[PDB]
Amino acid sequence: MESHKHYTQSETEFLLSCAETDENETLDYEEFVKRPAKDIGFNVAVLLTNLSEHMPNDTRLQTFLELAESVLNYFQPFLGRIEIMGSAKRIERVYFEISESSRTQWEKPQVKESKRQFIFDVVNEGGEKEKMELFVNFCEDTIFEMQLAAQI
Amino acid sequence: YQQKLLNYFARNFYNMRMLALFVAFAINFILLFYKVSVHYVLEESSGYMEPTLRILAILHTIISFFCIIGYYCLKVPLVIFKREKEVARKLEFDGLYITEQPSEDDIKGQWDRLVINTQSFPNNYWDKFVKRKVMDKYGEFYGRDRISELLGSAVLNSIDVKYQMWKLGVVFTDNSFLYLAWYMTMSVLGHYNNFFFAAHLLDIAMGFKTLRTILSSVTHNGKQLVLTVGLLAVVVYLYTVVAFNFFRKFYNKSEDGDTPDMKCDDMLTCYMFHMYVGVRAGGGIGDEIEDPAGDEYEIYRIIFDITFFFFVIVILLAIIQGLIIDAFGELRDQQEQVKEDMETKCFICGIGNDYFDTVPHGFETHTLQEHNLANYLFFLMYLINKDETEHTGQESYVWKMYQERCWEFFPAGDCFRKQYEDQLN
Amino acid sequence: TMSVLGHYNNFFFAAHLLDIAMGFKTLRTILSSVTHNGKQLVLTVGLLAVVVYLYTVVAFNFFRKFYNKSEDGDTPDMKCDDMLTCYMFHMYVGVRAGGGIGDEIEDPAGDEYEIYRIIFDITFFFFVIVILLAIIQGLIIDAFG
Amino acid sequence: ELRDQQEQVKEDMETKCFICGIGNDYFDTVPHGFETHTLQEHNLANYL
Ligand SMILES: [Zn+2]
Ligand SMILES: [Zn+2]
């Protein structure tokens, strides 16, 4: 723990003081499942994301986004956002987590050919309200597919 | 260990599938060095080919078995997901077996009755409150107990049969499983005669993608092609009618003169003659017929010959060629159009790439951050993965709309920026 | 190297006439059409080879007796009874005949395989002689368009 | 050319009102509005 972060009382030696578990002159790997912490980080990342996206144009908060950039880089792949028509008759964001299993299962395997065939058949045949339920059926069958492919 | 082996064949379905193709190639390559005196084998001074054939046939049958098991493990759950999902949606939002009771046609629906009475209907659709919701929806208008009676190393000692009869009736109707069973039957009957292994080389059309696109052109207009051949048959029937009425004496396919006659004087034989050498001659029927040098039917036989040529040999061939090339061009138009429509417009909204590109790159921001196919599906999968109590007002509203199937939450003709233009809003 | 080996044999200078494709612009555009879909063209020829392999399989199993390319009767036989020789025969005069394989084979006048040999002949014609040629032509014209 | 003909008639019917010739641009500001125009108000059927 020298290259990954710098070395202070409060960066590296802080961890080595947290890592005062064993008397065998060693350290087990339970300090990492102890430290857990990133579940707070996702919600605070989403907090700052909603604060920035809904309320931009504030230098005072931009200062804090500079502080939280290192965490936002961590939570960017898992932090999804989408926009939907709301109960108050307005579009607004829905910030929400993304898993890695669904990501890796959605990206690499044969399901991309399924998405290509889906988009092709949709935009060729077309439909008025025969588009979004087709998308949701594709999504549900694909969710089942990614679940089944995770199961091996 | 059984479960690990089954997951192996499921996961390794494509690899074993690709492997059986090349075993078929190796079999059919060794098939080239056959002879007769009975269909023996004579190699180029190498007696190793027969044991390779003997073991490779066994490998072919074995790997066909493993591919079939991989298909049964992997792709069958998906189609059953679709089926039970369809059945649940029909029970909920249409009340099929309550109100409709479909006809003798729709044999799927007539077959999908014994599944209704089972416990394990919602086995894979991950929606188990189906019977309860249908009881809520038709508990008094039609009946309450009517609905309920309508609806409801120690592994190999107890299992359902009511659901499983329906399931096996499903899987015996699926096409790819039927193909793999045909593949297995040809690999088994390869033992009875090794020439049967040549049937497995036709799996290249399923295997290769580009070959499937090569085949799509002739597949695209097979019906009109078969109509062209039927019209060809009708035209040759009219031509041999005109021949049998008039032109029989010229139909002498005997040897040189003063010979027994080998003639076409009937109608069926003349029709077979016209279909067999009228069209398969490259020049028409007049080539394989005694030339009309100074006859009263000289001009009429000449008219017969040239009209047969310029219609049968020319027009129907050109129509077949136009059909295949029109399939090529039309599939090109299809892919051009899908690229056009995806580039121009949002898949979700249909704004067009005109409102956003005022800002740099904005259409791509719209498609890649906000209104994503991916992020939307991940929110779907999230709420399927989430619990209804933990939902926000947003997620509860949306999950309500999901399981009652509204799709109004989806943006259409609008967006976050269109709503919230930067104008103190 | 071709100009040097032209000293060894002056016929080697004919290789240098193929530089017209590099030289002329319009000839490069003439050549681009067939170059544009060379892969699918080669796949068409491979499919042709596979189809002729199936056809000569059906022949070697059944139709060997008609494969008599000898002189008039009472002659030594010059026949195709093997599988490799029959495959070469189909690829050499089945497709290079303008009419199919039935032209270069004894006619089936009154045989038990008369209708089956007729089916063999017309299917060989209407598939091998027609469809793959039309696909090659469609490929080059689609490259043009 | 016959393919071009049928492509063009589908194009022109989808784009535009048979009656008015507005185009499918003024109405789709509202959801589904072009189809309201063709199926409720300015109908071939209701006019006949
Ligand atoms: Zn959009
Ligand atoms: Zn109008």
GROMACS .gro file of C-alpha atoms in nm, chain C residues 78-143:
model
   66
  655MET     CA    1  -1.408  -4.559  -6.999
  656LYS     CA    2  -1.632  -4.515  -6.696
  657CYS     CA    3  -1.668  -4.318  -6.373
  658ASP     CA    4  -1.732  -4.575  -6.098
  659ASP     CA    5  -1.522  -4.426  -5.817
  660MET     CA    6  -1.626  -4.121  -5.612
  661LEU     CA    7  -1.332  -3.888  -5.679
  662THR     CA    8  -1.347  -3.948  -6.054
  663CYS     CA    9  -1.724  -3.899  -6.061
  664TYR     CA   10  -1.686  -3.576  -5.861
  665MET     CA   11  -1.428  -3.449  -6.110
  666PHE     CA   12  -1.664  -3.552  -6.391
  667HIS     CA   13  -1.956  -3.358  -6.245
  668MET     CA   14  -1.741  -3.052  -6.176
  669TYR     CA   15  -1.581  -3.073  -6.524
  670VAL     CA   16  -1.885  -3.146  -6.747
  671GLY     CA   17  -2.184  -3.124  -6.513
  672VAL     CA   18  -2.147  -2.749  -6.476
  673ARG     CA   19  -1.935  -2.683  -6.791
  674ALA     CA   20  -2.197  -2.812  -7.036
  675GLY     CA   21  -2.477  -2.555  -7.069
  676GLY     CA   22  -2.759  -2.798  -6.994
  677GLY     CA   23  -2.623  -2.999  -6.700
  678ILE     CA   24  -2.494  -3.352  -6.644
  679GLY     CA   25  -2.765  -3.534  -6.843
  680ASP     CA   26  -2.619  -3.419  -7.176
  681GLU     CA   27  -2.293  -3.612  -7.125
  682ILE     CA   28  -2.466  -3.930  -6.998
  683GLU     CA   29  -2.656  -4.218  -7.161
  684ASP     CA   30  -3.023  -4.121  -7.190
  685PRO     CA   31  -3.266  -4.305  -6.951
  686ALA     CA   32  -3.506  -4.453  -7.209
  687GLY     CA   33  -3.726  -4.689  -7.009
  688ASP     CA   34  -3.547  -4.753  -6.678
  689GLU     CA   35  -3.672  -4.802  -6.324
  690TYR     CA   36  -3.472  -4.487  -6.234
  691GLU     CA   37  -3.620  -4.296  -6.530
  692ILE     CA   38  -3.822  -4.051  -6.321
  693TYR     CA   39  -3.547  -4.029  -6.057
  694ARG     CA   40  -3.279  -3.963  -6.320
  695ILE     CA   41  -3.515  -3.705  -6.475
  696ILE     CA   42  -3.554  -3.539  -6.133
  697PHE     CA   43  -3.175  -3.550  -6.092
  698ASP     CA   44  -3.126  -3.385  -6.432
  699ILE     CA   45  -3.379  -3.104  -6.398
  700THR     CA   46  -3.287  -3.026  -6.036
  701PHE     CA   47  -2.917  -3.014  -6.133
  702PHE     CA   48  -3.012  -2.775  -6.414
  703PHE     CA   49  -3.251  -2.542  -6.233
  704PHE     CA   50  -3.022  -2.517  -5.925
  705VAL     CA   51  -2.657  -2.541  -6.033
  706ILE     CA   52  -2.680  -2.393  -6.382
  707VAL     CA   53  -2.930  -2.119  -6.286
  708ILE     CA   54  -2.929  -2.001  -5.928
  709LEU     CA   55  -2.560  -1.970  -5.845
  710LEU     CA   56  -2.489  -1.795  -6.177
  711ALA     CA   57  -2.775  -1.552  -6.110
  712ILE     CA   58  -2.637  -1.492  -5.760
  713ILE     CA   59  -2.292  -1.408  -5.901
  714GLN     CA   60  -2.454  -1.169  -6.151
  715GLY     CA   61  -2.665  -1.011  -5.877
  716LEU     CA   62  -2.354  -0.965  -5.665
  717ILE     CA   63  -2.161  -0.779  -5.936
  718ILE     CA   64  -2.461  -0.564  -6.034
  719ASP     CA   65  -2.534  -0.489  -5.668
  720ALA     CA   66  -2.172  -0.375  -5.636
   0.00000   0.00000   0.00000
